[PDB]
From a paper:
In such an arrangement, the flexible [name] chains thread in-between two adjacent [name] subunits, and then line in the internal groove of the TPR domain. This topology explains why deletion of residues 7–13 or 350–367 of LGNTPR impairs hexamer formation. More specifically, residues 1864–1880 of [name]-1 start with two helical turns interrupted at Pro1874, where the chain bends in an elongated polypeptide, and packs against helices-A/B of the second TPR motif of the [name]-2 subunit, facing Leu54LGN-2 and Tyr58LGN-2. Analytical SEC experiments revealed that disrupting the NuMA1861–1880:LGNTPR interface prevents hexamer formation, confirming that hooking of NuMA1861–1880 on LGNTPR is essential for oligomerization. We conclude that [name] has a bipartite [name]-binding domain consisting of a nanomolar affinity peptide spanning residues 1900–1928 and a disjunct upstream oligomerizing motif encompassing aa 1861–1880, which is essential for hetero-hexamer formation.
[name] is the dynein/dynactin adaptor that in mitosis assists spindle assembly and orientation processes. The TPR domain of [name] interacting with [name] comprises 8 tetratricopeptide repeats (TPRs), each consisting of a couple of antiparallel helices organized in a concave super-helical array, in such a way that the first helix-A of each TPR faces the inner side of the super-helix, while the second helix-B is positioned outside. Here, we show that the dynein adaptor [name] and membrane-localized [name] assemble in oligomers that can form multivalent interactions key to sustain effective pulling on astral MTs.
Numbering used by the authors:
A (entry chain D): 1867 to 1878, 1902 to 1925
B (entry chain C): 1 to 367
C (entry chain E): 2 to 367
D (entry chain F): 1870 to 1878, 1901 to 1928
E (entry chain A): 3 to 367
F (entry chain B): 1864 to 1880, 1897 to 1924
Write the structure that this text describes.
C-alpha cells in the first residue's frame, strides 16, 4: 500500500496561481551603519 | 595650497576591506547585485580582523547570491555566517543566520533541514525574549511548510479533497504558524507584517480548500494594502479574491474582482498582469455562459500575448477561443483557432494540447 | 448535421489512455523519439488502471531501449517489475524480469542480468508456460554469449589462450541455446529455430568449434530460405564464410562471400556490399591471388569513398599497399601508403600513422 | 600487479554477424483498447 | 640482402614503437601529440614490466608539463603501484618523488610530505647519494611552496607572520642546507647553484635578508661559471629585491640596472619591462621622482607593446603617484583616469575603487 | 567543540597587536623545474 502509490499515476477550465507575498529582502544597509 | 596634496598620496595606496565592502553594499542598494558580488568577494580576499564586519559581509553575500538565484553560493556564505556566529557565541547572529540558511534550503527543496534551521531560529528567539525575531521565525516556518505542501500535486487531482495526507498536514502546519505570527504581530502593532501574514494565510487556505477563510484573510490584506497605498499588494489581493470566489461558485462576484485587477493593471501599465486579468475574465464569462463577452476578453489576452511573444499563452488563448466559438456555433472561426492551437502545441512541446487539438478538428470538420 | 452537440468532451484536453495510444502509434511508425514524449506525458497524467499502467511502463522501457537510453530503460522496466510484483501478476513479473535482464545485459551488469533472466525461466516453468520458458532460455543464452564476448577484443585471429572464464560462459550459452532449440523444435516454431541456430553457430565460432558452427549456420540458411528472409540468408552466408576461413578452406570461403555479395547487390545495401568486397579481398590474399585481391579491395574503396566512410578508406589503403607490394608495384604501393598515412592522421589512428611511416621508409628504397 | 592497465608476461575481417534483437511490442496498448471497448 | 619481404612490416604498430614515437614528440616539445601516442601504447600493452614502468612515468611527466595534474596523478600512481608489487624499490622511490611533486602543485601538502619522505628513506637505505640529494631538494621545495601558499607576505614596517608559515620556511631552509652539504660533497656544481637560489629566496621570505644576499651571491658566482645568462639575471633580480628590504636603495638600483643590461642583450621585452618597473620603484624610494617617472614610462611603453593590460594599469597607478609627488596635478589626473579605465577592463575591483578616491582628491586642486 | 583557533577555516582574518618601512616592492622568481627526462625509454635491452 505504501509501496503501491510510489509510481506516477494512481488511486480511486484553467485557473492561475495563488500569487504569494513577495520574499522580504528589505535589507541593504547594514555595512554603512557598521561604519562606527 | 591644498588641504591634502600629500594626503592624496595616502589614497594612492590600495583599497581596504571595509572600502570594498561598502562599495558592494552600495551596488546592491542600487539594484546591480551582479557587480556588488564581485566587490564583496574582493573584500573576502583582503580579509579583516573585525569579526562583526566579517559576519555582515558573509550575510549580505548570501543575500546577494540568493537574489541572483545562485543558491549554491548563497548556501556557502550563509553557512559561513552561521559557523562564525556559533564559534563566537553570538546567539542573536546565530538565529538570524539560521533563518537565512533555512530560506535558502527551502528554495533548493531540502525542506527537512530547512525546518531544523528555522526551528533553531525560533528557539533562540524565544530564549532571548526577542519578540520581533520570534515573529520573523514563525513567518519563516509558515513559508517553509507552505512551500513543502506546494511541492507535488501541482498539476494533480485537487477538487474536493483528498490529495495525500502529507500535503494537508504540511498546509495545516503553515496555517498554525501564520496564525501564531499574526497573533504576535498584531500585539506588536506591525501593520506591514500583518499584511504579509494575511496574504500568505489566505493563499494557504485557498490551497487547502477553505475558501471562505481565504476570502476573509485576503479582505484583510486588501484593507491593509489600501492603508499603505501599496497598489501592487492591492492588485494581488484583488486577484486572490477573484480566484476564491470562482471556487465558491459566485462567478458574478469573481468577475468584479477580476475587473478591479484589470483597472490597476492598466494604470500600472503592466502588460503581463493585464493579460492574465483578461484571461481570468474570459474564463469567468465562460462560466457565466456569456460566450460573447468571453471571446472579447480572450481576444484582448491574445493580442497582448502576441505582443509579449508569450508563445505558451498564445496557445492557451487559441484553445479557449476555439471552444468559446464552438459554444456559439461559429464553426469556421472555431476551426481557425483549433488549427492555431495545434500549431502552437507542436511548437512548445505541449503533448497534451497537441492530441486535443487533433480530437477537436476531427469533430469540428464533421459539422 | 445530426449530432452537433459534440466537441466539449473531446475539447477538454487530457486523458491518459489517449496520450498512451498516440505514443504507441508513433512507435509503430518508427519515430520512438516522439513516442517517448507522449508516453511520459501519459505518466504525468496517471491512471487508475494498473493493467494499463503496466503496459505503459513496459513500452516506455522498450522504447528507451531502442533509443539507446539504457538508463531510463532500466527505470521503467524496474517500475513494471515492481508493479507486477505487488499485484502478484506472475506472468507480468516474468516478462518484466526478462526485459530488465536484457537491459542489464547491454549495461554490462551480467551478474544481475543472470538473476533476472533466471527468474523469468523459473516462473515460466512454474506456470507451465512453454513459450515463455523457451524465450527465457534464449535470453539466458544471449546473456552468457555477451558475457563471454566482453573479455577483451585483443583476442583476434585466433587467440589460443582462452581464459577459462570465457570458455565456461560460452559453453553455458551453448547449453541454453540447445535447450531452447529442443523446446522450440517440439513446439514447432520454425522462426525461433532459425534464431537459435544462428546464435548457436556464432557461439561455437567464438569457442573455436568451427565444424559445429558450420553445421548450425547451414541449418540457419535452410530456415532462412524457407521463410524467404533474404536478410537472414545473407547473415548465414557471411557466418559460413567466416568459419571456412578459420578451417583453412579458403576456396569454399570465397564462394560463400560471393553469395553474400550477390544478395547485397540485390538488396542494394552498399554497406554490406562493401564489407563483402573487403572479405573477398582478404580471402584472395590468403589464396595469394593478389590480382583478384586488388580488384575487390578497390571495389570496397570506391563504396567507402561514396559512403564517406573515412575509417574504411584507410583500411582499404593499407590493404592495397600490401597487395601491390606482394606483386611488386612499388609506385602504386607508395601511393596508397601515402593515402594510408593521410587518413590515419585525419581519424586519429595513432597505430596506423606509425605503420604508414615505417612502410614508406622501406618502400622508398626501390 | 594484477590490475594495472595493459599487460601480461589481428588483421581485419569483420567478424561475427549476430542475430537481430526482436522487438514488436507496439501493439499491447491498442490491443487492450478493444479488450474493454 | 633480401628486402622483397616488407608486407610483414605493413601490419604493425608495436608497444615499443608507439612509445618511442611519444618520447620523440616530447623531446621536440610537442607533448600534446606525445600523450596520444603514449596512451596508444598503453592500449596495446606489453609483457615487459620495466618498459611499462617507463611509459607510466613519462606519461605522468608529460601530463605534468601539460598542466593536466589529474592525469599526471593517475599515471605516477600506477608507476608507484607497479614498482611496489615487483619490489623495484629503486623504482618505488623515484615514483614517490614524482607523485610528491604532483601533489605539491595540487596543494595537497600533507600527502606530498609523506611521498617525498618515502623517496628520502629508500634512498638512504640503498645508499643512493644522488637520490638522497634529489629527495632533500624535493622536500625543500614542498615546504617552500607550503609556506608560500599562505603568504600575503608581511615583513611590513615591523610585521608578524603565522607560526605555521615560519615553521614551514625554516623546514625548507634545513632541507636545502642538507641538500647543499651532500651536493657540495658530490661536486655537482649545477645542483649547488639550484640549492643556493632556493635557499636565498627562502631566507628572503623569512626576513633573513643578509643570509639571502649571501646565498644569491653564490648563485651568481655559479651562474657565471656555467655562463648561464638566465640564471645570472635571476640572481641579479633577487639581489636587488633583498637590498631593497635592507634599506640600501642605491645598491639595489645597481643590481636592477644589471638585470636590465642582461634583459636588453637577451632581447627579453617582458623581463626588460619588469626591470624598468623595479627601477621606477627604487628611485621612488630614493625620492628622485623624475627618474622614477622615466623608468615607469619605459615600462608602460613595453607593456602597451606586449598588450599586457594588467601591467599597463600598474604603470598608470605608479605614474599618477609619481606625478603627484612632483605636483603635476594635470598629468596625475590623466594617468588616474587611465588607471580607472584599465581597472574596470581587467576586473581589478581594488584598483577601481582607489582610482575613484584618487580622482576625487586630485580634482580639487 | 573546544577550539579557539581551529575556526581559522573561515576565509581570511586574525588579529595580532638604513631601513625601509612600508611602501610597495614586487615579487622574486625561484629556480627552474628541471626536466632532464626525455630519454628514459630510449635505452632498452
Amino acid at each position: 500500500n505504501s509501496a503501491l502509490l510510489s509510481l506516477p499515476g494512481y488511486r480511486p477550465f484553467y485557473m492561475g496561481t495563488c500569487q504569494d507575498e513577495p520574499e522580504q529582502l528589505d535589507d541593504w544597509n547594514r555595512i554603512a551603519e557598521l561604519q562606527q | 595650497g591644498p588641504l591634502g596634496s600629500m594626503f592624496h598620496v595616502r589614497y594612492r595606496m590600495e583599497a581596504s576591506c571595509l572600502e570594498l565592502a561598502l562599495e558592494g553594499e552600495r551596488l546592491c542598494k542600487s539594484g546591480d547585485c551582479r557587480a556588488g558580488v564581485s566587490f564583496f568577494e574582493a573584500a573576502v580576499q583582503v580579509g579583516t580582523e573585525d569579526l562583526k564586519t566579517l559576519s555582515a559581509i558573509y550575510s549580505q553575500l548570501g543575500n546577494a547570491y540568493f537574489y541572483l538565484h545562485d543558491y549554491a553560493k548563497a548556501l556557502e556564505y550563509h553557512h559561513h555566517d552561521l559557523t562564525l556566529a556559533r564559534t563566537i557565541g553570538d546567539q542573536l547572529g546565530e538565529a538570524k543566520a539560521s533563518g537565512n540558511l533555512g530560506n535558502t534550503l527551502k528554495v533548493l527543496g531540502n525542506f527537512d533541514e530547512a525546518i531544523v534551521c528555522c526551528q533553531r531560529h525560533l528557539d533562540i528567539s524565544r530564549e532571548l525574549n526577542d519578540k520581533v525575531g520570534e515573529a520573523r521565525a514563525l513567518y519563516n516556518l509558515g513559508n517553509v511548510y507552505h512551500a513543502k505542501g506546494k511541492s507535488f500535486g501541482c498539476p494533480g487531482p485537487q477538487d474536493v479533497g483528498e490529495f495525500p495526507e502529507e500535503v494537508r498536514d504540511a498546509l495545516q502546519a503553515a496555517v498554525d504558524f501564520y496564525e501564531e505570527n499574526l497573533s504576535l504581530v498584531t500585539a506588536l502593532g506591525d501593520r506591514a507584517a500583518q499584511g504579509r501574514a494575511f496574504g500568505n494565510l489566505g493563499n494557504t487556505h485557498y490551497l487547502l480548500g477553505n475558501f471562505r477563510d481565504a476570502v476573509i484573510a485576503h479582505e484583510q490584506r486588501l484593507l491593509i494594502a489600501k492603508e499603505f497605498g501599496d497598489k501592487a499588494a492591492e492588485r494581488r489581493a484583488y486577484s486572490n479574491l477573484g480566484n476564491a470566489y470562482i471556487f465558491l461558485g459566485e462567478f458574478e462576484t469573481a468577475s468584479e474582482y477580476y475587473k478591479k485587477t484589470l483597472l490597476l493593471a492598466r494604470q500600472l501599465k503592466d502588460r503581463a498582469v493585464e493579460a492574465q486579468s483578461c484571461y481570468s475574465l474570459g474564463n469567468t464569462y465562460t462560466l457565466l455562459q456569456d460566450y460573447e463577452k468571453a471571446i472579447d476578453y480572450h481576444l484582448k489576452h491574445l493580442a497582448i500575448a502576441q505582443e509579449l511573444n508569450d508563445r505558451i499563452g498564445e496557445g492557451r488563448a487559441c484553445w479557449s477561443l476555439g471552444n468559446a466559438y464552438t459554444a456559439l456555433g461559429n464553426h469556421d472561426q472555431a476551426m481557425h483557432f483549433a488549427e492555431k492551437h495545434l500549431e502552437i502545441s507542436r511548437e512548445v512541446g505541449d503533448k497534451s494540447g497537441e492530441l486535443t487539438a487533433r480530437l477537436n478538428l476531427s469533430d469540428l470538420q464533421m459539422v
